[PDB]
């Protein structure tokens, strides 16, 4: 499912991400935009052999099991395919563990390079929230 911007903002709000660990909702929508272009089915393979999965491009070396990343830790205790669902609940639950891990949203490279320090409020403007 390719989400609409305001559609994704409402689903992320319902799931408790607005101001989760201090990060306002616009940060999360910006991160989804640049990590996956709002597409739940996005996957991208990395040089170390791990793969990033879903709307927030969660990585198989640490967070989910895909059966082909040697020494994967599977900290969200889910198969990575669960992260490609039209229902974003597993992606949101795992993202909450990731953002709690110490480095905050700097865990997402597209957030640090394209969202951090910009006016992220623009990502939810015009939405009925």
Q: Which of 7, 52, 87, 119 is catalytic?
A: 52
Question: How many other CB atoms are there within 10 angstroms of residue 115's CB atom?
Answer: 24
Method of determination is X-ray
CB-based contact 66:72 (threshold 8 Å): yes
Provide the sign of the torsion angle of the four alpha carbons 102, 30, 95, 22, taken in this order: positive
| Nominal resolution (angstroms) | 1.7
Determine whether 123 is exposed, middle or buried from the number of CB atoms within 10 Å of its CB (0-12, 13-18, 19+).
Answer: buried
Q: Which residue among 35, 48, 66, 87 is the active-site one? A: 35
Please tell me the distance from the alpha carbon of residue 39 to that of residue 31, in angstroms, as a whole number: 12
Quote the crossing angle between the two packed helices 5-14 and 25-36, to the nearest 10°: 130
Query: For the stretch 49-75, what's the b/e string if a residue is b when 16 or more beta carbons lie within 10 angstroms of its beta carbon?
Result: ebbbbbbbbbbbbbbbbbeebeebebe
Active site residue 7: no
Asked if residue 119 belongs to a known ligand binding site, the reply is no
Domains of the chain: 1-129 (1.10.530.10)
Q: In the annotation, is 35 catalytic?
A: yes
Cα 69 to chain centroid distance, Å, stands at 20
Q: How far is CA 123 from the centre of its chain?
A: 15
Residue written as tokens 């669902």?
A: 85
């Amino acid at each position: 499912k390719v989400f609409g911007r305001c559609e994704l903002a409402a689903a992320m709000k319902r799931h408790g991400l607005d101001n989760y660990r201090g990060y306002s909702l616009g940060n999360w929508v910006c991160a989804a935009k640049f990590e996956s272009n709002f597409n739940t089915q996005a996957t991208n393979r990395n040089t170390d052999g791990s793969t990033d999965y879903g709307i927030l491009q969660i990585n198989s070396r640490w967070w989910c099991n895909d059966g082909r990343t040697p020494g994967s830790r599977n900290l969200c205790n889910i198969p990575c395919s669960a992260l490609l669902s039209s229902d974003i609940t597993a992606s949101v639950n795992c993202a909450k563990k990731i953002v709690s891990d110490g480095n905050g949203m700097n865990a997402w490279v597209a957030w640090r390079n394209r969202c951090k320090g910009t006016d992220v409020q623009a990502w939810i403007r015009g939405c009925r929230l």
